[PDB]
Amino acid sequence: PLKYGARFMNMQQRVIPIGSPSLTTGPGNDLQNTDLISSGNYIGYFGNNNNWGFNNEANWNFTDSRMNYAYQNFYSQIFLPWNEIYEIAKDSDSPSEQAILEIANIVRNIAWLRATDVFGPIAYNSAGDGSIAPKFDSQEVVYRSMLADLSKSVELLNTISYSVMAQYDLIYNGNVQNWVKLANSLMLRIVVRVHFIDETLAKEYITKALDPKNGGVIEDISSEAKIKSSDKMPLLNSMLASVNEYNETRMGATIWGYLDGYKDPRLSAYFTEGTYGSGSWAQTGYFPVAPTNSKSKSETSYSAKFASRPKVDSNSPLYWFRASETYFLKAEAALYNLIGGDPKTFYEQGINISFQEQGVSGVATYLSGTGKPTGLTGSNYKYGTYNHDLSIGNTSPKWDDYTGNLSKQEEQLQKIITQKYLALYPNAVEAWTEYRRTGFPYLMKPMDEAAPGRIGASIEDCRVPERFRFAPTAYNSNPNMAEIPTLLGGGDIGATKLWWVRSNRPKQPN
């Protein structure tokens, strides 16, 4: 499959921006746009040591240039190589070529799931029609269509027992059975994503996703989908540019609050201890940077340059889907009677698997903990004036321990989503999507109080943008985009809620 190789590897590096060490900071600038200074910053996985003069998405200013950039990083960059593969394989009678196309379809769909979850409507079904003016699908149609497409991929790949494109497969070394598991896992994630808005659709596929005869889902760490440097394609983890080169990405307040309050051993696995001051004055510890930082970049010994940093090296991988997520998805599914089983069991196994994924121990002690997330007081925060008590009306790790502010079922979901949030790190887009859909976990409020106003929201209804908006000028190049607001059911702005946002979405008490 020489004709598919380069194109397929390009696709894989595009799902979540990453590239060859020779491209230096390029892929890293892209990851900033998709994960680090945007989504990951909004939900508190990271904190920015910069405000970019309030000129970009970090502070919710969705400019034409940055949104066009986002469209490229979430949709168009991967469209290119996929389209060529499609053109070459779409009419092949060769089963091995059909398999290649379906594997390419899975990779495309994992990437475009992010695209629709970020923008809402996208050109999904029209993809490949060679149109100069792509027609967009409503988000509901994108979801319905993707589920059908995933089942199609699984049906075909389930008949393939030999290796496919091993030399160019940076994820599973040509093991089609694992690709099937990834496809069904994505199907599971999608079904859970729609159960609140469309339970019927959820039920139409969740059973097929978990049905053993269809290949199974990712339940073992050995089946996780991740990409990292290898002989097939050397790579430089794309978080390095922003973390070490630009000194802009640091540990977020929200995730720190949970890790600290829950006495989570993953705190040390995910982040480094920062330093404040120098010499005998230097204080060491886990110092977070608030979400949507309103302060300018600084590099003194008392600055965020030395706040806790994400632990990562050039050979570190980026994760597409991990076994722990599967368990949390099953937990929620069982909680709402979509599948059989005990929510608590799936919940605790998800945490156990996450600890194993991170190489940490003490899961039993962690599971019996009844502590609440730690708030950030004006005193504790050292990079400006900021405070938010994350503990208020929040929940603990222990399944049977209820705060009682929300209904019991609602708090159980809160525990599931909060723990999934912790296990998903650093998959920011998925965490951001899950927060917007459920309202969990509760987040540290943005520091820049002017940010919500930039997307048409207020400091009470939005702690994060509800979506990215398309670049206004893009409408000039494609007349089919004029329909976007109607497809959205609202204005093309960051405050417009996407299709899967559940009704009666909870908010942290005041």
Going through 353-509 in order, the beta strands assigned E by DSSP cover none
Q: How far apart are the first and last CA of the chain?
A: 59
What CA–CA distances, in Å, run from 52 to 57, 59, 413, 458? Answer: 9, 8, 36, 21
Cβ-based neighbours of 507, under 8 Å, separated by 6 or more: 439
The answer to whether residues 427 and 36 touch, using CB atoms and an 8 Å cutoff, is: no
Show the tokens assigned to 164: 């496919």
Evaluate whether 416 touches 347 at the Cβ level (below 8 Å): yes
- Within 10 angstroms of residue 196's Cβ, the number of other Cβ atoms is 19
Q: How far apart are CA 250 and CA 44, in angstroms?
A: 10
Cα distance between residue 396 and residue 373, in whole Å:
8
Specify the DSSP element, H or E, that contains 320.
Answer: strand 318-321
CA pair distance 27, 445, nearest whole angstrom: 29
Burial of 231 (0-12, 13-18, 19+ CB in 10 A): exposed
Q: Convert 440-461 to b/e letters by CB count within 10 Å (16 or more is b).
A: bbbbbbbbbeebbebbbbeeee
Classified as helix, coil or strand, 252 is strand
Burial of 222 (0-12, 13-18, 19+ CB in 10 A): exposed
Asked, as a colleague might, if the bond just before 21 is cis with ω within 30 of 0, I would say: no
Kindly provide the resolution of this structure in angstroms, with one decimal.
2.0
Distance CA 390, CA 386 (A): 12
Instruction: Collapse the DSSP code of 118 into the 3-class scheme (helix H, G, I; strand E, B; otherwise coil) and give the result.
Output: helix
Please choose, from the candidates 316, 365, 324, 363, the residue with its C-alpha nearest in 3D space to the C-alpha of residue 346. Answer: 324
Task: Look at the alpha carbons of 441, 446, 449, 452 in this order and tell me if their dihedral is positive or negative.
Answer: negative
Domain boundaries, the chain: 1-238+440-510, 240-321, 322-439
User: Residue 276: in which H helix or E strand, if any?
Assistant: strand 274-276
Say how far apart CA 449 and CA 353 lie, in whole Å: 38
Residues in the chain: 510
Closest listed residue to residue 16, CA positions, set 140, 115, 104: 115
Distance CA 58, CA 36 (A): 9
Dist CA 364 CA 65 (whole Å): 49
Q: Give domain 322-439's CATH architecture.
A: Up-down Bundle (1.20)
Look up the CATH architecture of domain 1-238+440-510.
Alpha Horseshoe (1.25)
What are the strands, taking DSSP E only, across 19-115?
46-48
226 strand-pairing partners:
319
Using the 8-state DSSP alphabet, how is residue 244 labeled? I
- Tally Cβ neighbours within 10 Å of residue 113: 23
Alpha-carbon gap, residue 416 to 348, rounded angstroms: 9
Q: What are phi and psi of 310, to 5 degrees?
A: -65, 140
Helix, strand, or coil (residue 216): coil
| Residues 117/256/420/102 CA torsion (nearest 10 deg) | 50
Alpha helical stretches, state H, 158-261: 176-194, 199-210, 240, 253-261
CB 174 within 8 A of CB 163: yes
Task: Return d(Cα 59, Cα 175) in angstroms, integer.
Answer: 42
Q: Say how far apart CA 85 and CA 83 lie, in whole Å.
A: 5
Q: Is the peptide bond before 426 cis (omega within 30 degrees of 0)?
A: yes
